[PDB]
Design a protein around this nucleic acid. Structure first.
Ligand code: AGS
Ligand code: AGS
Ligand code: MG
Ligand code: MG
Lengths: 333, 278
DNA sequence: TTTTTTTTTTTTCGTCGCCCACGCTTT
DNA sequence: GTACTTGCTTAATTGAATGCGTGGGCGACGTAGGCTGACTCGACACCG
DNA sequence: CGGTGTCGAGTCAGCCTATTTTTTTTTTTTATTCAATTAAGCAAGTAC
């Protein structure tokens, strides 16, 4: 009697809404397959575990920030490389004007299929993101530094001229327009960002990022990448020891961190991670500085152990399959 | 929260604004009420909602294209008299149609403020007649060229401040750790406007990731405050019996002694909730 | 029974949006 | 074996890490018309 | 006989057309990690 009139008035309003605005304009959340979270590999296996869902979410915005020469571009090109290996189309908006296409090829990016723009203004760069997002043909877009997205008024102006909150305003407007378009297209958007200092502050952290407050809110994931040491062959510095902290996560629990090696010319050391993950999950035994798999001594030191797993791709397939089985927190299906 | 009214929840990024609204909807669904979620931000995970105790199969969801579409679905559902709670996730993401059709860089002076002002006029009356709660979530922005005031603002202009019957300011104030593993957030809500009762009271609670609000953690702190639980440094004791060392052990005790929990809840309600139910 | 003639005068506002960036030893 | 004093365990509380000092703006339309420049088009004068 | 350059007519996007005011406000702010330090309960050591 009471419950019956409500069910009818609901059905009528759902009819009236779907009439006015189109068919999927309102529905029950259990029946919406568009609203399910789908991920893409980062290249790093330690980072796929730290993110909890097994990688970066499609249809969302992601921010990567950090200090100078910390691996922000290199990480972002390993995401594209792994995406192109699954027949996805990718775009690089290079606002910093500093992409070396030979390095991209050495990291395993298919140069010949990667779309690239070196745009004149910030407004031009963000209009090309909206055009590619609406198309539904591109799967991953990267925007290298938002620090470098100069508004048109600032490019036509003189050095010294004040433009109060202009880049902030442009980013606020861009997120409003993009968020919805990226979700309909199932397109991933990765913003790279530089660090700056905030002055006349209390005792917070003095580090900021460029481009205002909008992108913090709209980002589904935020990563903070840092160089924490050197990788040496005696004298020759051959790479960087790198730490990534998940500073915001809406698809799984945050404040997990990943540690891996970037080697100059190859990129992220995949077999290096697989050792450390093998040790942690008691599939590899560490006796001081001696690594042992099923009794058989694979090597002495991490480099020799890594070199062994290179030579035995059956053993490396076996351990990868096992670690994936165990340690992934939220496997989708 | 008052039925037939408008509520505003604002705060910084990942402070617990969406989590809190989903625990309201979960509670309302357990009293057989119908709820709706307008997701203008395009960032709801249905599996997280289910873990917080929402019935996913009876929760109406809209991912609207424009701000005017979003606010016309709110007006349609309000007039129906069928829906009891509506949540609109970010006001900041309610983009007007001129701005969507336009180019990036185009100025639309006071367009979103005007849209919001108009919506408040049309909604206020329809919600009261239907006895429908409307919760707006808002993001923070910064004012520039200001000395008189604090520099924090909210998006969408000045209408919503005036029409809101309750305004909540939610902030993360620390971590919850199991030694090393950060397992949750320590959270503070200030009641910044209130027409239903006296304002400026605050609430402190824990959000535990994949669980939601820590009920038993609050019940410990309220016990201590109302003298029903005895605290000695870091030692919590109910009627002599040492129920644990630290807040986490005490919380784990009240989980595995559910009769004691119901007895303490009943007394805390009797004392501090001075609006007895029908 | 015969046959139409010719215009007159305004009324009222509605609404914000956005940060940006260190500088420097002292014995 | 039971009663009295101290060490350690685990947790939470409060202080301190600090050093002090700021100034900059610009954008429109619900609704209108006339002028100006720069753009486009298609055909003929001239040249190969 | 076709291609290049020039001529004239027609059309799209931007912009410019001109007052005020007497000259205001806030009620307070945001925030963060590491260390020293302290205090009560259980177990260890001591005493009857
Ligand atoms: N073309 C290259 N060849 C060899 N090593 C490189 C090359 N480009 C970058 N690297 C190294 O890889 C590491 C990370 O470099 P990036 O990935 O460019 O860092 P980044 O975070 O983009 O910082 P920025 O761009 O300069 S603003 C650094 O140690 C670089 O020197
Ligand atoms: N799907 C999830 N799984 C586990 N934890 C989550 C998930 N979603 C959010 N959280 C955490 O719960 C806390 C509050 O998250 P939210 O309630 O989404 O915050 P918010 O106030 O909506 O701010 P925003 O939406 O990012 S603009 C944060 O520490 C989140 O990282
Ligand atoms: Mg770079
Ligand atoms: Mg939210």
């Amino acid at each position: 009697a009471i419950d019956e009139n409500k069910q009818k008035a609901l059905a009528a309003a759902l009819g009236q809404i779907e009439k006015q605005f189109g068919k999927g304009s309102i529905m029950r959340l259990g029946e919406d397959r568009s609203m399910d979270v789908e991920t893409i590999s980062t290249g790093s296996l330690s980072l796929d575990i730290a993110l909890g869902a097994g990688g970066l979410p499609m249809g969302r915005i992601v921010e990567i920030y950090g200090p100078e020469s910390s691996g922000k571009t290199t990480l972002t090109l390993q995401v594209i490389a792994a995406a192109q290996r699954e027949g996805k189309t990718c775009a690089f908006i290079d606002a910093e004007h500093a992409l070396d296409p030979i390095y991209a090829r050495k990291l395993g990016v298919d140069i010949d299929n990667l779309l690239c723009s070196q745009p004149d203004t910030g407004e031009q760069a963000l209009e090309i993101c909206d055009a590619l997002a609406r198309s539904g043909a591109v799967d991953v877009i990267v925007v290298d530094s938002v620090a470098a997205l100069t508004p048109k008024a600032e490019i036509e102006g003189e050095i010294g001229d004040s433009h109060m909150g202009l880049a902030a305003r442009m980013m606020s407007q861009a997120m409003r327009k993009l968020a919805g378009n990226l979700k309909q297209s199932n397109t991933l958007l990765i913003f790279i960002n530089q660090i700056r200092m905030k002055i006349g502050v209390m005792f917070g952290n003095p580090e900021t990022t460029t481009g205002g407050n909008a992108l913090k809110f709209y980002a589904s994931v935020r990563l903070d990448i840092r160089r924490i040491g050197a990788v040496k062959e005696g004298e020759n510095v051959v790479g960087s020891e790198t730490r990534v902290k998940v500073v915001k996560n809406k698809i799984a629990a945050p404040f997990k961190q990943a540690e891996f090696q970037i080697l100059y010319g190859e990129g992220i050391n995949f077999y290096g991670e697989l050792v450390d993950l093998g040790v942690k999950e008691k599939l590899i035994e560490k006796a001081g500085a001696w690594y042992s798999y099923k009794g058989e001594k694979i090597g002495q030191g991490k480099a020799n152990a890594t070199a062994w797993l290179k030579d035995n791709p059956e053993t490396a397939k076996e351990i990868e399959k096992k670690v994936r089985e165990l340690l992934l927190s939220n496997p989708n299906s």
